Every structure is written in structure tokens, then in C-alpha cells.
């Protein structure tokens, strides 16, 4: 019916170039789906030139 | 002296004596979990000496 | 610089399964959709689940009824299967009569305005003596996922009708979910791909209505994703409660007669905190109470260590 | 200060034997129903909170 | 020295859980670890996860 969605965040990032971000909570079988989507795009269909 | 299993317990309050009949017996049926009276029970010991 | 999908013919093929289509998906979001919806359809879609049952002359599970053939227990078991549809109400609490040497079919059951009951040959039991006869009141909820029986009793806070016998809840209408993404060719363009999401209902959800639902979560989940404040909460709670904690607590607490249990309820009085602090003068006046139904505050008051008539410049603090 | 020496003394607290409430009065020259009225407003004073939060959490 | 006796009778229903030991009929023990929800199993292309 209701959702969660999270709450604490820190994108711990080493340089400018490089980056890592923690975040919680997630539902159950959240962080998969949400992580392996965002992959997805993240990797194979994000516009650049080269 | 002799033990009882009187309803009566030593300081207890009407929450435990709920899933308890006058008798001191947990009726059948009662869903019943960790730490919850199945039969009040007193042994005698008198002249505590605090 | 982006396309984006829709939904063509979403095709029924039977009450419980039917194959939605989506049209207009560009490279590979095939899957991309395709694998994140199974994810969230599988779990976090609605359902409303008989959840709590209470029976005739029946104390609980493990017992039988005279004249059934089924035990008690595994009539529950038929139950957790009753499938079942409600609109606008959240807990409807259904009602099953009837007698005679007769399987007891989910449609003998009796309507609501909002009770559909998508599967009425549902076998809940068989009686098996002529005059031999039972009633139930079936307690449907609704919710997500799986509410297992045991998790249900911390609230307890008195679920004493002995007689309730809590099943565990399997809430949902998925019930396999499997997409493939078919290359399909919209007349020009390189190649779109088409998504036939093939799914498998208990009945109770409308395939359309679901899908929604499902992209639905996808958005609000997301939506934090998109921008990235590092929140955090305040925290640092308090470490000073000025009175004893015992003021907080509701008057049932005092395990004390009924009659002096409603006067506190009508006179305004659920903490003891306000108990506390109102004197015999404050009583007499108060509706029903005399000397046999005062003397009794006077002593669970005194067992306790608490009095009658106090004060406390302060009450109560502060959140 | 007195309330505590009152105290100490009808019970048994940190100190040999408890003393009959008479005993308690000669000892201090202000005697009888007097001191017994100064114990029980100790008593009273214990009973509330601030006070009485910590003690009663012995009691099980 | 008994004057009367109680015997009260329970039934427990235990589901399952990581640590639970279970095996076939060929020697084969094994002791299940993780619960896994349905999104995360192995599915074959008619969807139906193992």
C-alpha cells in the first residue's frame, strides 16, 4: 500500500573523478532491482561522445 | 509445608492471571509464549528474615 | 535526447493468467524493465488475505469438529487459499453457514457490497451428518507480501477471544511472473523492442490495474535517487525524565473493578498521571462513585506507592 | 539530616539492631508521636518522584 | 511428598530456519543458510523460479 524509502546517504567519494555511495533502507529485494537497473542504464545507454 | 497451586502468586499482576483460571490452570486453547504461567504454583516459606 | 514505452494490448486468457505487451522500447530497456518489474511485481503488489478465523465450538487448530471430516488445522489451510476481492473497506469480516451432509464450497458464504469471491467451487470443507452444522466469521485483511501467523502477536495488548484462530497470511496475487523481450519491429525505426510480460493471478487483480502499481513504485523508490542530499536524521534523544515513569502508564494498569475502570474512562482520566493528581474532593462529584467504589482506589494507589491529590509543576512533558 | 538519622534508626540500615520507636524519641530529647510523625513524612518525601523513580524499580 | 500434579501439554509449530539440517535419500546432508525471496531465485524462461 505504503512505500519506504530511504534515509542516511553518504556519497563518500575519492576524488573528483571516482565516487561511492552507501545508501539505506531499502525494502527487501530492493536493492537489487534498483541497483541492477540502474546499472544498466549507468553503463550500457548514457549519452557521450567519444 | 505443602505447596499450593492456588491462582494466588506472589506479586503478580492481572495480566499473568488473565490466561489463568480461579483454579490457577491456563485454560486450553491459550496461546501461550515464553515466560507466561502454565500453573500458578506456591511452595511455603515463612519467616523470611529481610 | 529519449523514446519512452506504453502499453498495447494487454491480452486475457484466463481469470487467473494473462500476456500485457509494451511496445515502444528502445535498445535493451527490454530488460532492463523487463527484469526490475519482475522484481517488484513479485513482491510488493496489494492482496487481501483471510487472515484472522474464528470458529463455532472450537478452542483451537489442533482440535476436531464433530461431523467434519477435515481437522480444524487444515481447514485454516483451506482458508489461506480463499481467494478473494475487497473495495473500499480494509478488514471485512466475511460470515460461512450451513448444514446438512454437504461440501461447503467458498460460495456458500454469504455477500458484501465489496466481497467478490473469484472462486466460489474453493473447497473449505465437508460436513458428513445429516443434522451436523457450522458457522464462522472469517477475518479478511489487506496488506503486501507474507504476514506469517507468528509475527502477528507483539501489538497482543489482549487478543484473549480464545477462540480466534490467527492464519498466517500469504497477501499477494502474484503468482509466477516471466516477461521476454521479443524483438518487435514498429514499421521504421532500427529495432524497438516489444516486452510480452507473461503473468499468473490469483484472480484478484486485473493485470492492467497491477503494472501501474508496480512502475508506481518504481518512480516514488527512485525519486531519491535522482538528487543526493547525504540526509541524516537529529538523533540525540533525551536523557532526563523528571517524575517517575509509572505517570505515563494507561489506568488498566491498576488492574481495579469495572465499575471504578469506566469512571476514570468517563471523568477523563486514561494516565495516571491525572489520576495522580485529583483529590477526593475531585470525586464524590464525579458520576458513581460512593464509599464502596472510591475505597478502591485508595488501595491499589497504596500497593503501588502512588497517592491520591499531588502535584507537579510540570505536567505532562515533552515531546 | 534528621529524617536520614530517623530512618537509619527504625530500621536496621548501616547500624546494629533497629530501635523501638521510644528508644528513637530519648535519643533525640524530642520524643514520642513527634518522631514518629518525622518518619513518616520522610516516607512520604521518598514516595514521589525524583525520589521515588530509582527504589521502586527493586520491586519486581 | 507429590500431592497433586499438573501436566500441561504444548503445540509448538515450527516453521524452518537457517540452521535446520536436511537431506535427501542419497547421503547428501546439508544444513539450509540463507532464506531467499522469490525475486532473487533461479527462474527458467517460463518464469517459474526453484
Not at chain 3, 472462486?119 to 479478511?140: F, G, W, Y
Not at chain 3, 525505426?189 to 507473461?198: A, F, G, H, S
Not at chain 5, 500431592?3 to 537431506?23: N, S, W
Request: aromatic share 4%; glycine share 8%.
Amino acid at each position: 500500500t505504503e512505500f519506504l524509502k530511504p534515509r542516511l546517504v553518504d556519497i563518500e567519494q575519492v576524488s573528483s573523478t571516482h565516487a561511492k555511495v552507501t545508501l539505506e533502507p531499502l525494502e527487501r529485494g530492493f536493492g537489487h532491482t534498483l541497483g541492477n537497473a540502474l546499472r544498466r542504464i549507468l553503463l550500457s545507454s548514457m549519452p557521450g561522445c567519444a | 509445608g505443602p505447596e499450593e497451586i492456588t491462582a494466588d502468586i506472589p506479586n503478580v499482576g492481572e495480566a499473568a492471571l488473565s490466561k489463568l483460571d480461579e483454579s490457577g490452570i491456563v485454560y486450553i486453547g491459550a496461546e501461550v509464549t515464553g515466560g507466561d504461567i502454565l500453573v500458578g504454583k506456591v511452595t511455603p516459606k515463612g519467616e523470611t528474615q529481610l | 535526447e529519449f523514446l519512452k514505452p506504453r502499453l498495447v494490448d494487454i491480452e486475457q486468457v484466463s481469470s487467473t493468467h494473462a500476456k500485457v505487451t509494451l511496445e515502444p522500447l528502445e535498445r535493451g530497456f527490454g530488460h532492463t524493465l523487463g527484469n526490475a518489474l519482475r522484481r517488484i511485481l513479485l513482491s510488493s503488489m496489494p492482496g487481501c488475505a483471510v487472515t484472522e478465523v474464528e470458529i463455532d465450538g472450537v478452542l483451537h487448530e489442533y482440535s476436531t469438529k464433530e461431523g467434519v471430516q477435515e481437522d480444524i488445522l487444515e481447514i485454516l489451510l483451506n482458508l489461506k487459499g480463499l481467494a478473494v476481492r475487497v473495495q473500499g473497506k480494509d478488514e471485512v469480516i466475511l460470515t460461512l453457514n450451513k448444514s446438512g451432509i454437504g461440501p461447503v464450497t467458498a460460495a456458500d458464504i454469504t455477500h458484501d457490497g465489496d466481497v467478490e469471491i473469484v472462486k466460489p467451487q474453493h473447497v473449505i470443507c465437508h460436513l458428513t451428518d445429516e443434522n451436523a452444522s457450522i458457522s464462522m466469521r472469517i477475518k479478511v485483511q489487506r496488506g503486501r507480501g507474507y504476514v506469517p501467523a507468528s509475527t502477528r502477536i507483539h501489538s497482543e495488548e489482549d487478543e484473549r477471544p480464545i477462540g480466534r484462530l490467527l492464519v498466517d497470511a500469504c497477501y499477494s496475487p502474484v503468482e509466477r511472473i516471466a516477461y521476454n523481450v521479443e524483438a518487435a519491429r514498429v514499421e521504421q525505426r532500427t529495432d524497438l523492442d516489444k516486452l510480452v510480460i507473461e503473468m499468473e493471478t490469483n484472480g484478484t487483480i486485473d493485470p492492467e490495474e497491477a503494472i501501474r502499481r508496480a512502475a508506481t513504485i518504481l518512480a516514488e523508490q527512485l525519486e531519491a535517487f535522482v538528487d543526493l542530499r547525504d540526509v541524516r536524521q537529529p538523533e540525540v534523544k533525551e536523557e532526563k525524565p523528571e517524575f517517575d515513569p509509572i505517570l505515563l502508564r494507561p489506568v488498566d494498569d491498576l488492574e481495579l473493578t469495572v465499575r471504578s475502570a469506566n469512571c476514570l474512562k468517563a471523568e477523563a482520566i486514561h494516565y495516571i498521571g491525572d489520576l495522580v493528581q485529583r483529590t477526593e474532593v475531585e470525586l464524590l462529584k464525579t458520576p458513581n462513585l460512593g464509599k464502596k467504589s472510591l475505597t478502591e482506589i485508595k488501595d491499589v494507589l497504596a500497593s503501588r506507592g502512588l497517592s491520591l491529590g499531588m502535584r507537579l509543576e510540570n505536567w505532562p512533558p515533552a515531546s | 539530616a534528621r529524617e536520614a538519622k530517623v530512618l537509619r534508626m527504625r530500621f536496621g540500615i548501616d547500624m546494629n539492631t533497629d530501635y523501638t520507636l521510644e528508644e528513637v524519641g530519648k535519643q533525640f530529647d524530642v520524643t514520642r508521636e513527634r518522631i514518629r510523625q518525622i518518619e513518616a513524612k520522610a516516607l512520604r518525601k521518598l514516595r514521589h518522584p525524583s525520589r521515588s523513580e530509582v527504589l521502586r524499580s527493586f520491586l519486581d | 511428598g507429590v500431592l497433586k500434579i499438573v501436566k500441561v501439554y504444548l503445540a509448538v509449530k515450527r516453521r524452518i530456519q537457517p540452521g535446520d539440517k536436511m537431506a535427501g535419500r542419497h547421503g547428501n546432508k546439508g544444513v539450509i543458510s540463507k532464506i531467499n525471496p522469490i525475486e532473487d531465485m533461479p527462474y527458467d524462461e517460463n518464469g517459474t523460479p526453484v
